[PDB]
Amino acid sequence: APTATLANGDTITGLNAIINEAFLGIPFAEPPVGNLRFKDPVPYSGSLDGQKFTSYGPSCMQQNPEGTYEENLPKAALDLVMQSKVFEAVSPSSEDCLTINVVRPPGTKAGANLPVMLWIFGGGFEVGGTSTFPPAQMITKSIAMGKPIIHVSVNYRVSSWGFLAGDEIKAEGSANAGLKDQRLGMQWVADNIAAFGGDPTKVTIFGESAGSMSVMCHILWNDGDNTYKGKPLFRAGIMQSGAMVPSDAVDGIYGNEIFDLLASNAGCGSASDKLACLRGVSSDTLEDATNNTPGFLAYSSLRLSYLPRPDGVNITDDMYALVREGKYANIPVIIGDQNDEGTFFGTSSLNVTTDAQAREYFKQSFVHASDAEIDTLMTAYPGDITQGSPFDTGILNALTPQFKRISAVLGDLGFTLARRYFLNHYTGGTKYSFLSKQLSGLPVLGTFHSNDIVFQDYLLGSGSLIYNNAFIAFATDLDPNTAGLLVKWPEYTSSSQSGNNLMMINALGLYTGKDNFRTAGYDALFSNPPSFFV
């Protein structure tokens, strides 16, 4: 029923979901299999003429989040579930996974020129797929707002498949493959979205957690040059939990350590050219080898095995330096956080219970930090349980004497204070920032990471006003205030500005606040950002 004629004259068919029209599973690149493994994506050559695109394709290979070189119950249990024939059926993955999805309001036609919202999924740069993020809620609300948009989602390679690093990858020019996947998708949107009814000049990119940091990397890509065929690939971006990535170069110490471990795991330890050896192992072997490197829920936690790393070519330097140096696209942006980002991640080191153990965990996590720096971090983030995350919970949630403390650090460095740093330096365009406390009172976790996905794609809640409405108005008019919410959203210029600069969300609704919390931690962490890089 629904139809579109692509740029190359190919005419495809979609699905009429009644409440929207969807074209799912459209291939945008040649399958990154065999010798194309770990390499930049290759534009899709082929004919889609006469093809129907009515279901999501498989996601790229996924990493066991509890994966690790050690052996334990959580790992064994997860692999059990993961390789189960039922899981493989309801949730299929493959190395051939580079597909793109387009979902629009019913009745949309070529030339409608609707604003486009390109979604980049999260998942710690190690798991993830586009199928788990329904556009229906965002789409329906846009229609009801008189501000219809087109939702575009793109599959990208995660884990070893898309973020392998080291000297060989570096020498080959194959760094950040997964980010290049997202980049190609953008180019595809620029070339073909008009046929679906969208306006290529009105693309807003957005993502959550790893997807959010990805948006940041796109702002920083090619020193800020975001053009394609003489025109920018996007007019704005929305960052849901996550700013710059605090990581060393692709051929740094941890990037190389991981590469070597994976190579040994695959049985390529003796190879002169480990990279070509890795291209030759079967998918199974490669999957096994990767699940034997640390996953993000394992003890290593947020000191990720796979993530974006500066390569000196597309991400030319330390990402914090690129922001201080002004090497970014000049676009209006929305960037926010959930109050307790680190509590889910803090559950990974619950065998750390004394300050002595905390000091060593931090020392293991941040190899570049000096003792004095570690001392400052531990003064700035005290053992006092009433000081940790879930914030403002007093003596509650004391899983261990160090849980709330570790959770406070991880969340701040990884997301919340990192956002403040960006905001205090970015002069590219108008800035709007939010902080959600929607789930205050939720035991153990508080307003934890990714809860915004629920209220954006699944359930309706006070937060949806921001996650759908406010985000829709921004994608359409470049100002969230066009949404007509009762609380006006103030522009953010600096964390030192007088007057409220944060949109805030609680269980009942919205209100405004100041982004002046935990200044001691901010300087402990950001006086010299590279001291805390992974």
Ligand SMILES: *[C@@H]1O[C@H](CO)[C@@H](O[C@@H]2O[C@H](CO)[C@@H](O)[C@H](O)[C@H]2NC(C)=O)[C@H](O)[C@H]1NC(C)=O
């Ligand atoms: C908490 O558990 C972790 C994970 O098992 C311990 O770290 C492992 O310890 C073994 C034995 O010393 C090492 O061979 C592994 O390399 C460690 N794993 C990682 C991922 O580093 C850690 O020592 C425990 N911490 C405490 C304070 O008991």
Ligand SMILES: *S(=O)(=O)CCCCCCCCCCCC
């Ligand atoms: S992150 O780990 O990438 C996002 C994880 C979100 C998982 C939520 C788990 C919540 C457990 C309690 C649910 C109560 C309904």
Ligand SMILES: *S(=O)(=O)CCCCCCCCCCCC
């Ligand atoms: S999200 O997809 O739920 C989580 C994204 C994790 C990003 C981690 C980036 C590295 C953080 C380093 C500081 C903590 C050691």
Ligand SMILES: *[C@@H]1O[C@H](CO)[C@@H](O)[C@H](O)[C@H]1NC(C)=O
């Ligand atoms: C990466 O950098 C090189 C050098 O600037 C450039 O030719 C190439 O087009 C960039 N790749 C992407 C995907 O932008």
Ligand SMILES: [Ca+2]
């Ligand atoms: Ca090596």
Ligand SMILES: [Ca+2]
């Ligand atoms: Ca500039």
